[PDB]
């Protein structure tokens, strides 16, 4: 069994450095060439560099500034070190033998690197629905504002309400903080009786918010 596991990753303050190891098992790290790729949130795959079988680095234009792709045969690792990190560098970094002109292609699972200026838990405000104006169906939700970094997960009634839930992708507000909404459609007749609570969880700040959403 061949395997490629990725080490390192986490919160890095801007200008700081990320160091990511890529540990192989079932084969030797010096018998193939290896790339580092990254995928920003919602964006496409972006090649960073490629270390040939001969230990020769081939960085990219934007990467040649602050990127060193080394290899350690003692520990069976290929390493990526980036300096001078910007907000555009927050992404999921993979290591891989891309497999363009070879039958052997292997990828790591990907480790997340987040460039954070501050850690800020979210503020949760109700999206209140009674006076419902959509017949027998009402909409309600939770507005999750001003948090950093990603991600937040949202459930409803501790996961007992999943039908009709729409949790939107976060957007980066001009203030530099993330925000998102989670909505759900419910019987407008159930508003006075059924309880609706959104469970917002922000692990980077160890914060969890449960918000009862009531009419008016």
């Amino acid at each position: 069994e061949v395997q490629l596991v990725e080490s390192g990753g986490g919160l890095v303050q801007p200008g700081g450095s990320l160091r990511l190891s890529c540990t192989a098992s079932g084969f030797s790290i010096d018998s193939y060439g290896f790339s580092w790729v990254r995928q920003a949130p919602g964006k496409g795959l972006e090649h960073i560099g490629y270390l040939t079988a001969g230990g020769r680095a081939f960085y990219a234009s934007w990467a040649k500034s602050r990127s060193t792709i080394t290899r350690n045969t003692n520990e069976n690792t290929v390493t990526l070190k980036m300096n001078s990190l910007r907000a555009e560098d927050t992404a999921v970094y993979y290591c891989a033998k891309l497999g363009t002109g070879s039958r052997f292609a292997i990828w790591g699972q990907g480790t997340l690197v987040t460039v954070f200026n501050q850690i800020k838990g979210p503020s949760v405000f109700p999206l209140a629905p009674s006076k419902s104006t959509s017949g027998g169906t009402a909409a309600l939700g939770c507005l999750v504002k001003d948090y950093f970094p990603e991600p937040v997960t949202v459930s409803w009634n501790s996961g007992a309400l999943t039908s009709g839930v729409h949790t939107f992708p976060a957007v980066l507000q001009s203030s530099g903080l993330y925000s998102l909404s989670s909505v759900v459609t419910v019987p407008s007749s159930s508003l006075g009786t059924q309880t609706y609570i959104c469970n917002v969880n922000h692990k980077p700040s160890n914060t969890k918010v449960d918000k009862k959403v009531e009419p008016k």
Binding site: G33, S35, V37, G44, L45, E46, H47, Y50, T52, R56, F58, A60, S61, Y94, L98, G99, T100, G101, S102, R103, A105, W107, Q109, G110, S123, F125, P126, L127, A128, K131, T133, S134, T137, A139, G141, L143, K145, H166, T167, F168, P169, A170, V171, Q173, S179, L180, S181, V183, T185, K216
Partner: protein, 218 residues
């Protein structure tokens, strides 16, 4: 350096339809077969489906087939299946005797084809709790609609807002293949309390649906 570009950025086909995605390379790939096709689902790592331009990997369904020639490369899905709707990247390797480089395409979403469905539009006033912090958020919800394309305009006292809204869109729902969209208008409490009528105008095709509220009437 090199770059890849595919066709199109997004498409819509049916279960059993014949899908064709092309891919153009900036230069000639170093090795002739240095072209692979990657299938990536949301929240999942990329999965290589085809290497060596035309060679399928073991386990890959034979309905997939790559037919590249020079700098034009095609991914063919004979009978499109439910598990084939995803984003497809092409990746090419091109360097020299003293160079070795890759570049990915931009991607191509193979979306489900769906009959037109109008959105259920809801508007949400800012909560009183938020207003105490100095900022007002007005949210407009477009629930379970198709197609994705839609014009959402904010009006404050019949004055079209510009540059103070942000949109977010879900992926296609796994049951009805619809989209949901939110538009969030951001104002200060001072500006929010200066006006009365807040309206969200949703336009797609020949129809415009406007949901609104008066600040204070509940």
């Amino acid at each position: 350096d090199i770059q890849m570009t595919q066709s199109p950025s997004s498409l819509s086909a049916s279960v059993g339809d014949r899908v064709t995605i092309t891919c153009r390379a900036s230069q000639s790939v170093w090795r002739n077969k240095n072209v692979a096709w990657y299938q990536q689902k949301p929240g999942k790592a990329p999965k290589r489906l085809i290497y060596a331009i035309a060679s399928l990997y073991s386990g890959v369904p034979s309905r997939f087939s790559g037919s590249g020639s020079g700098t034009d490369f095609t991914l063919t899905i004979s009978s499109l299946q439910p598990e084939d709707f995803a984003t497809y990247y092409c990746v090419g390797h091109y360097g020299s005797e003293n160079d070795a480089y890759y570049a990915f395409g931009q991607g191509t979403k193979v979306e489900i084809k769906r009959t037109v469905a109008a959105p259920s539009v809801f508007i949400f006033p800012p909560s009183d709790e938020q207003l105490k912090s100095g900022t007002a958020s007005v949210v407009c919800l477009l629930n379970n609609f198709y197609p994705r394309e839609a014009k959402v305009s904010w009006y404050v006292d019949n004055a079209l807002q510009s540059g103070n809204s942000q949109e977010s869109v879900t992926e296609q729902d796994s049951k009805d293949s619809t989209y949901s969209l939110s538009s969030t208008l951001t104002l200060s409490k001072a500006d929010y309390e200066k006006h009365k009528v807040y309206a969200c105008e949703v336009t797609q095709g020949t129809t415009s649906v406007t949901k609104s509220f008066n600040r204070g009437e509940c």
